């Protein structure tokens, strides 16, 4: 309910390139600053012969919007022999995937092919740069010997990647073996460690990896999206991972050990070619300190009350629990054909309130299909399916669908306020847009009627002017606030205090303050967060037996609240927002006897 | 609150009354029935839509048996049988074919046999009267291939559903797509792999009789799929030589008006298979509403010449000659705020009613 | 260039026997196709009879053609083929010749069946 | 029916041309190569050499070089062989074929002796 879709940073880059295609944050251990990475797939690059190479851009944020490329490969094709094209970097996608872990920035090509050393040939293979320090080392784990469709030479490596805990890099190849998919682990620094330039297939010591099965399990594309989190007590973050096509493309989500790759779960759809497991994600959305498993369906078709077939999509959320088993639950999307369950971010505890929240996409929803997100937040039994904030893309198609939400990374905070930011891509219209997270107060609102027990006989006060005696009673209220994260000092409140307004407009109300002769009062208050509560207190008193539709009803007094939104805000205009989840309505009954 | 049916000139033999208005006021409901009667010996359009892929090649020599053999057994089902013919294989990219200039120009390893290059989808032969052009464009069928097993049959079909002026699809005539394969068929989001990240918007891209946007654009979803065969009026049968044959099968539940069966290893059964599945569809009948009104809610129910009820899509089974179905349909309104069309599924004859608030 | 090696030269049958012959290649003859691990070995099989062209039984070492009767069975893998007659009749005295098509295409020496008496 | 159509027999002299014809009849010619087959006179067969008529453009076998070259006529669905500077070792019956496998044929032959 708290980000800020109002005041956006928007990044843009070349016509074409698919700018926004895939984004991540990056955030080195010492920079005081941080950036944005924004991938650009078909971007054309100043390498030599190379076209729509592709290329990975480090963006600013403090300041100006600029974005520059990072020199990964800043070369073209190397030979093999003369005249004889050892690699073909052309139309490679490079950017297609990124991500990074502080420093460390792991940047795909999944398109990238070769030739092999034994006969001249176009493979598939896929190729990754990894930097870090001062250095950038190419890792390519299924470049090796092991060639042709029943070996890795159509593995596509790099086509889906994450980053394990443990300083190892997990590498989803989903055309290894006949597209039977496969898993490639190894560590950081075997990887930066182990290179040699002059050498195209390096073996590694610490390496981690899935295996050919029987054909029965041919073009299932294990590897297609993967995701990390411990999975079964061990202290190690194990491997995620999807496979789309799986048992008769119903789809399944797979778990390995992060430690020997035994398998240790099964997730499998329910629905033929609903692609379960297109995307995969893992978080603790309950505060059970279990990584719990979401799954998208992007496919699925909801039966309507005829049993009409709508293509809407799916996502499947299971919570871990400890006893080793998972409780499931299912989330639908909103729109048709808008693919919803296409993308899962987490967004770490965006809104502070102790659990974490997911961002999951629908690229094809909304008006002229601009595509949407929605924000689902957590809670102690799990996702809530009902999402708190939607957000939408502000841009037209021009030859495709912006496809807003296509690809999202949350839970980093770039504007330093406590509260994790979001970045979404949009990259059919090649742009990317990061939207802060507001801070969020929490109000403590009283409100109490001194004595509840009013009446016509008991007079205890006069009335200002002429000293008519009336029944009298005071109505107090008090407000104390405070947030999690930056947030003014300062916090500018209104409010106002209604008596007996709970009824038929034109009845009389029976309840005024004495000083005005109303039913109605405002406040301008100005309360320091995480003080005291700031009171205040009016004297009501009733009508007396003259003016009036009755002598035995309820009074309801209530009390209204809410934010000034002129004055609260932070050096960059960031507006903080009341908790969406608690009363800024409240009351209190008293009663006449 | 009423139901008003026309006492005008109807314009349909099958479904009728094909044009209703209502008036509806919030909290109201009305209803009417709606009579289905298929008809006997109707004009047929049956087009082959072809896998030529190689694994195929065993099979699609057995197609040269089929044009005279076929037109004799549907003259007992039909009145006039039309045949036409199209290919298709896979989308022309990496990885799905090699893109390695000597292996592209032969497209297959085999020397002895000369493959075509690889195509999404062609168009080969008109719908016509003319069996002998039918046979010829099957004889002069040159096998391809590919590397990856799967193939863009689905993409293929929704051209060939949706470009009625290329295929010489008629009004007149029970549109059936008989789709011939082994394999299973690729997903709208397998696409990934070859980088394309573009949605298939459902239209027509024909030039001459090649669909040319087989590169850049994804394979359509079984809910586009469904969606376009079903506003084409299109009865998709389903061919299927392999033990993929259960993974079509089984698809049946999410393709409404589809229907498959088995090639035997021999290939034994090529007419028998579409005849069979001719007289089967003849004979179920089921209805969908398109419902764009907002506020307005339908609830149809078929109700069987055997005395059994069932609803929605369900429909009724083993209808035949001189045998009406009956749809009970009702209208009810829960909110104020145009048209819905109810028909037959594979039928060319729909019912528009028009739904009129008073508020 | 992959040469093909076929024998024996001279083979001795009588009608009604089951009749075999073989083909083995220097090099592998199964190449990548429609199917994963189900490959296609680049392999026929032809009969000529004396005066006459030859005609095509079998191809892919395995499928038959159209009008072949069902006793030329062919099979095998990799470098080393076979082809059993079943019931070899007086009618199927012929040279049989083997010929592979994974690269530059090359027939064997022909193998010549004749009655024995 | 697809069928092969040969010229007849040919009696050359030692360093002559011959022009061996095969007419194709019954099929899209232009869809398919030809083959050239090699019969020696008590041997068995050795494939010379394709024509892609769909580019026009031959392959030969690496023994079959140099006095071996092949030309199209597509006008009347025809191919040739053409075998320069005759040697006594090319006395053989030459074959055209088609090798699709569900539609191949060959053609009666053409006798070629030189003296
Ligand atoms: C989630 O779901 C996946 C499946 O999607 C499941 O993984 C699969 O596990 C099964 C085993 O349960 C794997 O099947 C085989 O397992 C044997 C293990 O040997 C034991 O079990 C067999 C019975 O299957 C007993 O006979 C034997 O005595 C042991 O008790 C492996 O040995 C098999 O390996 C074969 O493939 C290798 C490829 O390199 C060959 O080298 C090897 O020789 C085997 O080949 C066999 O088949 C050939 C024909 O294809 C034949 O020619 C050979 O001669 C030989 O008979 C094999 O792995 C299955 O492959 C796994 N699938 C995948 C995709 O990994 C997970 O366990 C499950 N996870 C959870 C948590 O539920
Ligand atoms: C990258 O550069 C290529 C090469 O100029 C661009 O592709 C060309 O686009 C023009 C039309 O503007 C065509 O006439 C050329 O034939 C195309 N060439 C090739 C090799 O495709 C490409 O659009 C550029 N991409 C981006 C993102 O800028
Ligand atoms: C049906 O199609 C066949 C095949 O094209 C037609 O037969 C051809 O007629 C032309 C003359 O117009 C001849 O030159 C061809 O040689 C014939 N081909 C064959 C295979 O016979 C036939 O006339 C068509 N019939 C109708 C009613 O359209
Ligand atoms: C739906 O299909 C039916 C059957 O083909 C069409 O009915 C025929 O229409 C033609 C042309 O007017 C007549 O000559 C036939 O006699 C009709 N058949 C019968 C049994 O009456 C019908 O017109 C089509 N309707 C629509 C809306 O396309
Ligand atoms: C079509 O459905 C309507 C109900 O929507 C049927 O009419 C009802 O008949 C029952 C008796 O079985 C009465 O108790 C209800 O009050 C009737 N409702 C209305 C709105 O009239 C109607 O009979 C059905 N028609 C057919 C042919 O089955
Ligand atoms: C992987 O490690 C776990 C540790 O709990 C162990 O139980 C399991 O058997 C190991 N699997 C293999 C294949 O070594
Ligand atoms: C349609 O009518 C049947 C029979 O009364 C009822 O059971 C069903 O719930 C109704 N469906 C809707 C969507 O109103
Ligand atoms: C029902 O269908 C079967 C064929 O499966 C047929 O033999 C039978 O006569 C049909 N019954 C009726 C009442 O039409
Ligand atoms: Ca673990
Ligand atoms: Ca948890
Ligand atoms: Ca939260
Ligand atoms: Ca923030
Ligand atoms: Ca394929
Ligand atoms: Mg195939």
């Known amino acids: 309910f708290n980000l800020d879709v109002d005041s956006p940073a928007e990044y843009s880059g070349p016509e074409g390139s698919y700018f926004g295609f895939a984004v991540d944050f990056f955030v080195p251990s010492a920079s005081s600053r941080m950036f944005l990475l924004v991938g650009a797939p078909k971007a054309n690059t100043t390498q030599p012969g190379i076209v729509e190479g592709g290329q990975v851009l480090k963006c600013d944020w403090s300041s100006t919007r600029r974005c520059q490329p990072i020199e990964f490969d800043a070369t073209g094709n190397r030979d093999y022999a003369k005249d004889d094209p050892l690699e073909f970097k052309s139309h490679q996608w490079f950017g297609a995937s990124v991500r990074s872990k502080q420093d460390k920035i792991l940047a795909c090509a999944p398109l990238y092919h070769w030739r092999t050393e034994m006969k001249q040939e176009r493979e598939p293979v896929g190729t990754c740069f990894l930097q870090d320090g001062t250095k950038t080392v190419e890792y390519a784990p299924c470049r090796s010997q092991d060639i042709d469709a029943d070996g890795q030479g159509f593995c596509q490596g790099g086509f889906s990647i994450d980053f394990t805990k443990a300083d190892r890099v997990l590498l989803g190849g989903p055309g290894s073996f006949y597209w039977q998919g496969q898993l490639i682990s190894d560590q950081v620094a075997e990887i930066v460690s182990k290179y040699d330039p002059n050498v195209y297939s390096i073996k590694y010591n610490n390496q981690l990896a899935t295996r050919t099965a029987q054909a029965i399990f041919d073009d299932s594309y294990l590897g297609y999206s993967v995701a990390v989190g411990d999975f079964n007590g061990d202290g190690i973050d194990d491997f995620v991972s999807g496979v789309p096509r799986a048992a008769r493309t119903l789809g399944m989500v797979y778990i390995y050990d992060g430690k020997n790759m035994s398998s240790l779960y099964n997730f499998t759809g329910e629905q033929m070619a609903a692609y379960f497991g297109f995307s995969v994600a893992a978080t603790d959305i309950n505060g059970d300190d279990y990584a719990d498993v979401f799954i998208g369906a992007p496919l699925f078709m909801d039966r309507g009350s005829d049993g009409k077939l709508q293509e809407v999509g799916q996502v499947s959320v299971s919570l871990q629990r400890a006893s080793g088993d998972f409780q499931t639950t299912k989330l639908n999307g909103f729109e048709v054909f808008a693919r919803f369950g296409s993308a899962i971010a987490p967004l770490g505890d965006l809104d502070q309130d102790g659990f974490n929240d997911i961002a999951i996409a629908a690229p094809y929803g909304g008006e002229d299909k601009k595509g949407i997100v929605y924000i689902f937040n957590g809670r102690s039994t799990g996702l809530n399916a009902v999402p708190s904030q939607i957000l939408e893309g502000q841009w037209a198609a021009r030859s495709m669908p912006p496809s807003f939400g296509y690809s999202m990374k949350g839970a980093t905070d770039i504007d330093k306020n406590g509260y994790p930011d979001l970045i979404v891509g949009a990259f059919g219209v090649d742009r990317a847009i990061l939207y802060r997270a507001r801070p969020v107060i929490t109000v403590n609102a009283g409100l109490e009627v001194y004595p509840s027990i009013l009446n016509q006989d008991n007079k205890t006060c006069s009335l200002p002017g002429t000293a008519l005696k009336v029944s009298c009673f005071n109505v107090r209220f008090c407000l104390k606030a405070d947030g999690k994260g930056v947030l003014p000092r300062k916090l500018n409140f209104q409010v106002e205090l209604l008596l007996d307004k709970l009824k038929q407009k034109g009845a009389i109300r029976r309840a005024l303050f004495l000083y005005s002769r109303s039913p109605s009062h405002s406040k301008n208050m100005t309360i320091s967060r995480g003080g005291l509560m700031q009171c205040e207190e009016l004297i009501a008193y009733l009508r007396d037996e003259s003016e009036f539709r009755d002598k035995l009803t309820p009074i309801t007094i209530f009390m209204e609240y809410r934010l000034d939104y002129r004055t609260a805000a932070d050096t960059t205009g960031l507006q903080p927002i009341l908790n969406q989840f608690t009363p800024a309505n409240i009351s209190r009954q008293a009663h006449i006897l | 609150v009423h139901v008003i049916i026309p006492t005008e000139n109807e314009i349909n033999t099958q479904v009728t009354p094909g044009e209703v208005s209502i008036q509806l006021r919030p909290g109201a409901e009305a209803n009417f029935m709606l009579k289905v009667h298929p008809l006997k010996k109707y004009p047929v359009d049956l087009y082959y839509l072809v896998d030529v892929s190689a694994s195929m090649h065993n099979n699609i020599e057995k197609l040269n048996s089929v044009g005279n053999d076929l037109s004799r057994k549907m003259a007992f089902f039909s009145r006039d049988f039309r045949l036409g013919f199209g290919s298709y294989v896979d989308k022309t990219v990496s990885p799905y074919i090699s893109i390695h200039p000597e292996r592209i120009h032969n497209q297959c390893s085999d020397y002895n046999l000369d493959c075509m290059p690889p195509h999404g989808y062609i168009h080969v032969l008109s719908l016509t009267e003319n069996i002998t052009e039918f046979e010829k464009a099957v004889h002069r069928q040159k096998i391809s291939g590919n590397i990856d097993t799967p193939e863009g049959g689905f993409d293929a079909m929704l051209q060939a559903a949706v470009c009625e002026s290329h295929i010489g699809w008629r009004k007149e005539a029970k549109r059936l797509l008989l789709v011939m394969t082994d394999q299973t068929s690729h997903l709208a989001l397998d696409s990934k792999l070859a980088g394309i990240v573009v949605p298939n918007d459902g239209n027509c891209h024909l030039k001459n009789n090649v669909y040319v946007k087989s590169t850049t654009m994804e394979h359509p979803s079984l809910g586009q799929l469904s969606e376009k065969l079903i506003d084409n009026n299109i009865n998709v049968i389903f061919a299927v030589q392999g033990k993929q044959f259960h993974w079509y099968k089984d698809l049946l539940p999410l393709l409404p008006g589809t229907i498959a069966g088995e090639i035997e290893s021999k290939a034994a059964n090529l007419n028998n298979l579409v005849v069979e599945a001719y007289q089967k569809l003849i004979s179920e009948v089921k209805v969908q509403v398109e419902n764009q009104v907002q506020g307005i809610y339908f609830n149809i129910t078929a109700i069987c010449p055997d005395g059994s009820r069932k609803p929605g899509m369900e429909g009724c089974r083993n209808v035949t000659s001189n045998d009406e179905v009956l749809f009970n349909v009702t209208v009810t309104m829960k909110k104020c705020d145009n048209y819905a069309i109810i028909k037959p599924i594979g039928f060319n004859e729909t019912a528009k009613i028009h739904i009129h608030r008073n508020c | 260039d992959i040469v093909m090696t076929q024998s024996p030269s001279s083979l001795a049958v009588s009608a009604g026997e089951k009749v075999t012959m073989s083909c083995k290649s220097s090099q592998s003859l199964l190449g990548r196709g429609d199917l994963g691990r189900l490959k296609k070995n680049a392999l026929a099989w032809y009969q000529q009879k004396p005066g006459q062209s030859p005609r095509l039984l079998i191809y892919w070492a395995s499928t038959r053609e159209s009008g072949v009767p069902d006793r030329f069975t062919g099979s095998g893998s990799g470098t080393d083929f076979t082809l059993t007659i079943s019931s070899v009749q007086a009618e199927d005295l012929a040279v049989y010749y083997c010929k592979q098509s994974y690269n530059l295409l090359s027939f064997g020496a022909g193998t010549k069946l004749e009655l024995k008496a | 029916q697809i069928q092969l159509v040969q010229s007849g027999p040919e009696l050359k002299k030692p360093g002559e041309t011959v022009k061996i014809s095969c007419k194709a009849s019954?099929?899209?010619?232009?869809?398919?190569?030809m083959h050239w087959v090699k019969q020696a006179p008590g041997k068995g067969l050795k494939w010379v050499a394709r024509?892609?008529?769909?580019?026009?453009?031959?392959t030969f076998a690496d023994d079959f070089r140099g006095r071996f070259a092949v030309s199209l006529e597509t006008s009347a669905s025809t191919a040739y062989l053409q075998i320069n500077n005759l040697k006594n070792e090319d006395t053989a019956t030459y074959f055209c074929?088609?090798?699709?496998?569900?539609?191949?044929?060959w053609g009666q032959g053409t006798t070629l002796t030189v003296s």
């Open positions: 024509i892609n008529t769909e580019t026009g453009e031959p």
């Open positions: 019954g099929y899209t010619f232009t869809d398919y190569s």
């Open positions: 074929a088609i090798f699709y496998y569900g539609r191949d044929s």
